[PDB]
Design a protein around this ligand. Structure first.
Ligand SMILES: O=c1ccn([C@H]2C[C@H](O)[C@@H](COP(=O)(O)O)O2)c(=O)[nH]1
Ligand SMILES: O=c1ccn([C@H]2C[C@H](O)[C@@H](COP(=O)(O)O)O2)c(=O)[nH]1
Lengths: 316, 316
């Protein structure tokens, strides 16, 4: 079944997984060096053993494709994944004249009252980002995020490079190249970044009229992270392919530190007791071609019949 | 046997290998996405099924470790791997007042007279690089090569970053980090580089007091390239480990485009008819610790009993 590699990877971290400490002082079962492949011709690798929000995955990838880094786009799309990061910048700022917020996330877990307070301050921050144009420009712009790494790499000459744009043209004029690489890792920025790119780098490959993509993920949260990651990059492999008039090949997910937080063990076992149903089908608008111009309505997901969602706490 | 993964990878490219064109207009049998691991506690993965020059591998890695990019060091060490690149720069220069040299490499294959001519001009170039200090500074400095990528990454602020130095300190003060990454890929330089880094990026990992390393090689020549690559990075895993007082773990080689040139098929088959002997043993000088200060004499290779070398033409 299409999503087997994932379950396999999951089962493995449990079995061969060696305990290992980490930043968000929780424990993890980790493995180092893994690689799994998904033959995109057999279907879309969005998990059926647990409900994954394709809407979220879809709007995030577009945000990246637009070379956008401001949270406003996502919010307009009911997407709040990157919310914490902008909120945090806001709170550490001179203007934040509100309640105690330092460590809002980790605190909310065992909230002394926090729950509503945090959740409301956040509602406020967002609401302003959506309307106060100047506020959005200030606290709503994350800066160095995938959108800017992929499409506006800052060069030593104060210029900007559209890695993705260039690779796409390359694919068209030189499909057999081995230099079709887009990179999110900048040695200059990581020493002072909030969260250095987990999706460190990806390579494209063309053969027999099919497009393939390999991702190198330096670090991954098997439970919460991987499900989206596989969905996100498989989508990209289709999008880029659609634009180049190529057939879709394989999506390959390679790992550095693949781990499962100690507070996710029961949940994952639950999942491992499920039987994958047939994988869904992706449908891209035939009329449109420049993916940089793709809109949500141009991406349909057909036949996604999943098992109920699984709730598990974010380890912090 | 330790080197099995390599033979396995080799056998595979023959069997599942899909023909694919390439730059040096020759043909290739290619696969996309492969990963193999070598448990460095079982021995050193320097091939016994064919003689690999450990001396060359050793002096090259030191050259990188010194953050050096001038060919003089290598020549002083009888190492000529990077010779062509500096020679080419020399020939395309105003000063090169010699015979016809444009395409020296590919031509030498079916030399109309070239052999000696090229080989002598080269001897001249080198000889000068070794003695004429100003010549070395001019035509002997390659510039952007591993030594500068690893230890003097040029930032947008005209400064320089010692990625390797920083990662080593990191390993010591934060061994459980998932950000121990050194990168040779610069989106800014690749568009105008002679040869963008095949050894694209590598990640370190520490667990149970052992050090592991994973390399991401965007493109590889299974026959001529991989044998050195495995040797080079396994050596680094030992060196860094020796410096951090860690035990050696696994070396993991991940691949983008792994290929075998069509003009290497017979030779590789020859190799595949050999039986691996026990792997050699690496011995590092116990007295020395700062690997940036390691000298050739500080690296011993014990019990290397290989099969005679295999000669095969460099495809161009
Ligand atoms: O697809 C993804 C992207 C990010 N993360 C995770 C990786 C780490 O678990 C955490 C960040 O902590 P560090 O890896 O930076 O140390 O976020 C994932 O799990 N999956
Ligand atoms: O360990 C190594 C380093 C380099 N090369 C190869 C990779 C390619 O075969 C060739 C460069 O051509 P491009 O990959 O840049 O297209 O040099 C190897 O085989 N092995």
């Amino acid at each position: 079944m299409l999503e087997q590699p994932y379950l396999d990877l999951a089962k493995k971290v449990l079995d061969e997984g060696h305990f290992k400490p980490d930043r968000t002082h929780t424990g993890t079962y980790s493995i180092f060096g893994h690689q799994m492949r998904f033959d995109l011709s057999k279907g879309f690798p969005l998990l059926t053993t647990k409900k994954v929000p394709f809407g979220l995955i879809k709007s995030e990838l577009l945000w990246f494709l637009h070379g956008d880094t401001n949270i406003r786009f996502l919010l307009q799309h009911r997407n709040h994944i990157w919310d914490e990061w902008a909120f945090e910048k806001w709170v550490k700022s001179d203007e934040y004249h509100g309640p105690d917020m330092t460590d809002f996330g980790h605190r909310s877990q065992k909230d002394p009252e926090f729950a509503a307070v945090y959740h409301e301050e956040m509602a406020k921050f967002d609401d302003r980002v959506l309307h106060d144009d100047a506020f959005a420009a200030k606290y709503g712009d994350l800066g160095l995020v995938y959108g800017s790494q992929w499409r506006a790499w800052h060069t030593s000459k104060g210029d900007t490079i559209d890695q993705l744009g260039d690779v796409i043209e390359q694919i068209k004029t030189h499909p057999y190249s081995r230099r079709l690489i887009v990179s999110a890792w900048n040695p200059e920025d990581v020493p002072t970044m909030a969260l250095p790119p987990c999706h460190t780098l990806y390579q494209f490959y063309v053969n027999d009229g099919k497009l393939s993509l390999q991702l190198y993920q330096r670090s991954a949260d098997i439970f919460l992270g991987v499900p989206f990651g596989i969905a996100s990059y498989a989508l990209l492999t289709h999008l880029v392919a659609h634009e180049c008039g190529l057939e879709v090949g394989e999506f390959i997910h390679t790992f550095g530190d693949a781990h499962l937080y100690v507070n996710h063990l029961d949940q994952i076992k639950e999942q491992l007791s499920r039987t994958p149903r047939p994988a869904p089908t992706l449908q891209l608008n035939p009329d449109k071609h420049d993916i940089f111009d793709f809109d949500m309505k141009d991406i349909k997901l057909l036949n996604y019949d999943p098992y109920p969602a699984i709730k598990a706490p974010v380890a912090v």
